[PDB]
Amino acid sequence: SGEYPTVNEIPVGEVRLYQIADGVWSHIATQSFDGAVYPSNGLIVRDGDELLLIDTAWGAKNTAALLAEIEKQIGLPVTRAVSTHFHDDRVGGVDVLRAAGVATYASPSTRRLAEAEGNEIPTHSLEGLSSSGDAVRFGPVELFYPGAAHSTDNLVVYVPSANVLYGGCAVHELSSTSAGNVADADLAEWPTSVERIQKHYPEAEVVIPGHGLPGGLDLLQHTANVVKAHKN
Numbered sequence: 001s002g003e004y005p006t007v008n009e010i011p012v013g014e015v016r017l018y019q020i021a022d023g024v025w026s027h028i029a030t031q032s033f034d035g036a037v038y039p040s041n042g043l044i045v046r047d048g049d050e051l052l053l054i055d056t057a058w059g060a061k062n063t064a065a066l067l068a069e070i071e072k073q074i075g076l077p078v079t080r081a082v083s084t085h086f087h088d089d090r091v092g093g094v095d096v097l098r099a100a101g102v103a104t105y106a107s108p109s110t111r112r113l114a115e116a117e118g119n120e121i122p123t124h125s126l127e128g129l130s131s132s133g134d135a136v137r138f139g140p141v142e143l144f145y146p147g148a149a150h151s152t153d154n155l156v157v158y159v160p161s162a163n164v165l166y167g168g169c170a171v172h173e174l175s176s177t178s179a180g181n182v183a184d185a186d187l188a189e190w191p192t193s194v195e196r197i198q199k200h201y202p203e204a205e206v207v208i209p210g211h212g213l214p215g216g217l218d219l220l221q222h223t224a225n226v227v228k229a230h231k232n
């Protein structure tokens with residue numbers, strides 16, 4: 001009923017959208033992994049009379065449900081998608097998207113890692129993002145590679161029209177107490193990567209984590225803090 005939707009409020013298989021700003025929504029879905037249930041966020045950005053999608057809804061059937069929810073609530077076609085790292089909460093559902101006419105994109109790093117892991121593989125490579133601090137335009141967003149954090153390939157997305165920073169899994173929600181799933185992470189570089197984000201997007205008004213509740217710029221410092229303390 002208007003609050004940001006949380007894990008116990010979304011059955012697995014259903015997707016909710018949340019209006020962030022004019023022409024910007026998050027998408028929220030839930031999935032089982034290793035016997036526990038988790039929420040996950042992505043982004044939708046209006047691109048004229050089309051939509052740009054950031055990240056799948058974590059699975060084939062969740063992603064089909066995402067497309068249906070978008071048609072119900074927004075009614076414009078998703079034409080392109082970007083996956084912000086190689087994990088299943090970002091690429092699982094890419095095959096569904098491709099079969100629905102969506103052109104799927106990711107960095108070459110992400111594509112390699114997805115292929116090696118046996119995850120779904122976006123079709124098109126995003127060049128120009130291989131060095132930390134790199135940025136490229138993609139429709140109504142800027143894609144930014146901050147350096148290794150949650151994963152070596154993680155990208156962040158900025159919506160300049162709305163000052164919305166989508167951190168993906170490199171950014172945690174304020175209630176976080178732990179670095180999350182860190183098997184592919186670089187705990188030593190993660191604070192430095194977050195500091196790059198802080199420096200590059202000082203006007204961000206909304207910060208959206210990969211999982212959990214959006215907030216403001218404090219999510220960035222909080223993330224750095226949690227990661228440093230976890231490593232320690």
Ligand SMILES: C[C@H](NC(=O)c1ccc(CN)cc1)c1cccc2c(-c3ccc(CN4CCOCC4)nc3)c(C(=O)O)[nH]c12
Nearest residue numbers: 033038087088089090150169179180181182183184210211
């Ligand atoms: C899809 C993704 N696969 C991986 O990561 C992965 C998988 C395999 C390998 C090595 N082959 C390496 C990495 C993933 C799965 C499950 C939970 C997560 C989480 C996550 C997010 C938040 C929390 C904190 N909650 C815990 C319970 O209650 C309160 C808060 N825990 C885990 C993330 C993420 O941190 O981005 N990704 C996940």
Ligand SMILES: [Zn+2]
Nearest residue numbers: 085087150169
């Ligand atoms: Zn991940």
Ligand SMILES: [Zn+2]
Nearest residue numbers: 089169210211
């Ligand atoms: Zn994640």
